[PDB]
Design a protein around this ligand. Structure first.
Ligand code: 4NC
Ligand code: CA
Ligand code: CL
Ligand code: CL
Ligand code: CL
Ligand code: FE2
Ligand code: FE2
Ligand code: FE2
Ligand code: FE2
Lengths: 360, 360, 355, 351
């Protein structure tokens, strides 16, 4: 059931800007995002913590909101002009989606804002107005050995990747890389507005669920330091996967888990995608260098676990099961297959993960 | 069973200096060590390749010798004076070990040298005299993104760790770190002469076998590049384990496999141990941060596979089975267990490896 | 003052390549390929086409053999084929000389417009380019000093506000500038692609080309370039740096090619893509504005820059700056700079910082 | 010349700590703790004891409040308790003033000998020291500019060959030096622990302490110290660097504390533990010998250094160097340097 291209013009989206995550214990979440990861507090009270990255000048990149059920409440994109908020509302209304408009914002430090239940069930926000804060980009007196410098992207789990992809393309996102097989299945797509590999991404699976939110560092040693610090804090069990080099995106990466199991990616040194004919890279799902370039196996939780998302009433969205083939199953499952070199039996894996492991 | 302390004085050992590895295909081995890893050729012909690291001034750190059976032929330590070669001879003769002395060396670029079949079955060489070569430490016109800068250590597999450790202490090696359990079994020990965490190390297992030879890089990004390069060359299947941060030694590391399955470790940034009361560190075998500080699982091959070693006639040394408990079995096997925090079931793993894998 | 055309500006994506005239193609090849590691897309006896590690367009740099070393063309890529028509109509309304070739001026570029712009610089605008193998994951080739992207140009021009207004009308947004308390502007940086700049204006006699800048992934890659140059015993071709910039916050290095074209190596500036991106103005006497660590700026950096050509290949006449000189006001005989505004301690009178 | 004693030399392991007199303890604390990130081992209203990230002995630096900023002692650890007795007999034979404190001079050091050595420097030798928590895996504490080890001292002394021979007799091995064709020695670097140096001699008016050096893991940690100093608007306290040294091949930075004591931050020199380690001699006119990239050495780096104290805490009188001056022969009015030997292109004359 293809999502039609509206007649109404798409809003001009600049970039991913922030996520609002509902968390169950505000103090525990603060310990993770401020004490462990070093994000900078823009505002806080007994109910919410507003955080930003080192180089950010808008009010925040992450809002932690206390609530009964941990979930993504909104993933927010900044648009180019005030008028683009109106455009977003018209566009989503033409799509038959539920929308909510608040002239003075949903969260502090954001002004006129539109939230929508998008066609894939995700809570998106579009805004232009935001309170500017001290840009900390040269505050080396504050700089952490693991400093998170920008918000980079979101990654969403959705059962039908082509359907979602076409809709995001009409919205103005361009696909930079994807993962497909030779039987017409798409397992994942990455798409951008700001000229990096992505602002959001679609990962095939039961959904809507939020896979992760990604922050960047300046250098690879910064990511190493986050791992090292987690070991010193004896929370290495909260390192889910990595560190590694991605095939898709070519970024150096790490995946960690917050106190409510919300997955955070730390990411650095992908490439420029701003030209409109940027070459789209398609990896085969059985290429064992596509997710980790070094061939390290992808732990099953990375495929199966992701966060709930909320509707505009704050209720959890029903999960719709994926019927397309599962990346987990076709790569590391019982009938799975992966290769190191296409066409070479040597360095290939049948019914198990790479590097001597099987599914727990 | 115990190896007695000789009345004869131990030779004053400076450091690990080089290994001679037998390889089956000299050209394939050359491609690995020179073209992939960037080691510097000090001499080569149809029978051997002599290689050194970027900062070395002695003739070589690695001799690849063509032969029918891939194996370690000699682990060589440089001694402080010519007279220390005589001391090595008298010492091992007193221990009842087979020795062979060549005034003009066993390999090119080494002078007066003593080889011995040591009490643990290993072929050790002791030498002072060596041909000095151009020290390439400032040849940044040659420096590669993955540059190997020193030889750091060897790691030996032997069935009875305390037996070997006592013997090495009498030779002057001082233990820096080890792995034990609460019931008094020793699994591994690291010991040094040169003021780093180790020059050699004992890993409990069937032996004698050579577990690995280790080279150092300047920085962590150099190790990352070796991984990246191996992905680009589509030989990621030869990255065995890593990259990571060690618990033991605190070094950043990587384990890769040469064309004959000889394991090479790349290592950086361990600490100073030269003071005589250098604090020893003992880790519990069930501590999942002891080998990889970030908790990443140790692939079973790392525990089970190691290179054959030769006797002085060039024949393979018979293997003696370990009877003490197996590290693999007590940690990642079906009956093993490991913990993130001592005493905490959260972040513990029972009958499987960390992060969600079981053994393949 | 340069008027704003009625005609719509072209939609400019980014700086894309420079064409440099060099006098000895072999010596230039040694510097750019052997020393700096750039990748050859094409070469013959007259020209070398080079690209950075992550590029997919044909080239980021063209070395063209010629009698007088100079900038021949600074090229920006535009969003669509129709934007090259928009560029042509725009520069015509501006009264500028233009030349358009449906098959390009250099190999690997198709339909292209070159202009002598209102400040005397040879701009090219194009969309069509021959795609080549993007080397971004070719870690088998990766150098310890690898140049990964083309980042920006920097232009010397006598009247900065005049130039700034023209580039703003063309769609560039000022991210950072350098001014004083007496109304003088000494420099401005401006962008299309969401980094600190795609081009920049440095106040001085002009038109001249100050430098062309390439990126590395990390700081250590820039350190390696310096280390390599020492090993090759060509450290005399390191002009300034390495350092941390104040303006841009990037880690940097300035080196000189065999014809004294200045190349900057640059890494890790910040995102400027939001339209209300806060502008940062530095005082010209702030000794942390160019080098954040207070290291002195050698006079050659201010005084030396490359000639630029018109569309016929002749050198552009240099027009003298009459506004105050950043050299003179900070490190000349009557210069001044401070470490902390209003503190005599750490200030410099009539001399450069650090002794 | 300084005669070799018949008494055996103490077996010196390494440079271990310096005691610096500072005039304003709180300002000094800001610098070494807040700016540089050193770790407190003990403090009171008169002294701050500080250590690096990987240290297990009590401290690498003692800041002592006093009227005149100076080096009070540069301390070397010896291998055994008996080596303190050896040091005492050795310096007594040399005719030096010595002072033995069986319970140490500063907290966390036990039996210790301080001497006014033959070059006028206050050396300490000790074995016993209170072990503290070794912070080497305390990544929860690790700074982006983390100082990981004490690496070396550098001493200004007028006659380098005289001092060199005295240090060699004590067991130090020279690794690198700077000379000219006329036979003058301008500087020498010498070690016990298997790095390029534990101490070094810079030709000049002395005794003065040129600097104390700490190590970082990587080059980016040094860059961060500079960046942090910029952010704190104290970039005027960056003296020289960052750079790559020629001698030592280390990546380096020189900064100045509140009393103008010079601190070097240093990383990635090479192994020198073999007894036949090849010695490297640079020509004083080679513009890549100090900074490999050919950046100029600011004259203050040659002319400024810290006072040193005698055992009564009074400042040691200075002896003027009579041998040729490295500043004068390279950057002075009749000085010169080269990039490539024999090439006027890339050479500097009177600048
Ligand atoms: O080359 N020099 O200027 C040097 C080399 C090493 C040092 O530790 C130093 O203080 C100076
Ligand atoms: Ca298929
Ligand atoms: Cl992935
Ligand atoms: Cl290990
Ligand atoms: Cl600048
Ligand atoms: Fe991601
Ligand atoms: Fe090892
Ligand atoms: Fe620039
Ligand atoms: Fe030094």
């Amino acid at each position: 059931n293809e999502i039609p291209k509206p007649v109404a013009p798409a809003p001009d989206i600049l970039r991913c800007a922030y996520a609002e995550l509902v968390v169950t214990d505000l103090a525990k979440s603060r310990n993770f995002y401020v004490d462990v990861l070093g994000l900078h507090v823009s505002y806080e009270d007994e109910n919410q913590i507003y955080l930003r990255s080192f180089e950010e000048f808008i009010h925040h990149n992450l809002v932690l909101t206390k609530g009964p059920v941990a979930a993504l409440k909104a993933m927010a994109f900044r648009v180019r002009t005030p008028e683009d908020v109106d455009k977003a509302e018209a566009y989503y209304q033409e799509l038959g989606c539920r929308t909510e408009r608040r002239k003075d914002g949903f969260v502090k430090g954001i002004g006129d804002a539109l939230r929508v239940e998008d066609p894939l069930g995700f809570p998106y926000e579009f805004f232009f107005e935001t309170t500017h804060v001290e840009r900390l980009h040269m505050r080396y007196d504050l700089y952490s050995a693991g400093e998170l410098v920008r918000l980079d992207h979101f990654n969403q789990v959705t059962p039908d990747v082509p359907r979602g992809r076409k809709y995001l393309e009409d919205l103005g996102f361009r696909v930079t890389e994807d993962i497909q097989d030779d039987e017409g299945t798409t397992y994942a797509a990455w798409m951008h507005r700001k000229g990096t590999v992505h602002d959001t991404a679609l990962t095939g699976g039961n959904g809507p669920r939020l896979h992760h939110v990604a922050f960047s560092t300046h250098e690879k040693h910064n990511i190493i330091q986050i791992c090292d610090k987690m070991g010193a804090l004896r929370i290495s069990d909260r390192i889910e996967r990595g560190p590694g080099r991605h095939g898709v995106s070519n970024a150096f990466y790490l995946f960690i888990l917050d106190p409510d199991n919300h997955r955070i990616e730390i990411y650095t040194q992908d490439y420029y995608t701003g030209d409109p004919d940027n070459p789209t890279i398609t990896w085969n799902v059985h290429d064992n260098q596509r997710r980790d370039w070094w061939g390290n196996p992808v732990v099953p939780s990375w495929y199966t676990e992701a966060s709930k998302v909320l509707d505009l009433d704050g209720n959890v969205q029903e999960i719709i099961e994926r019927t397309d083939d599962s990346e987990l199953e076709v790569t590391i499952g019982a009938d799975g297959f992966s290769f190191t070199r296409a066409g070479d039996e040597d360095g290939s894996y049948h019914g198990q993960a790479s590097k001597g492991f099987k599914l727990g």
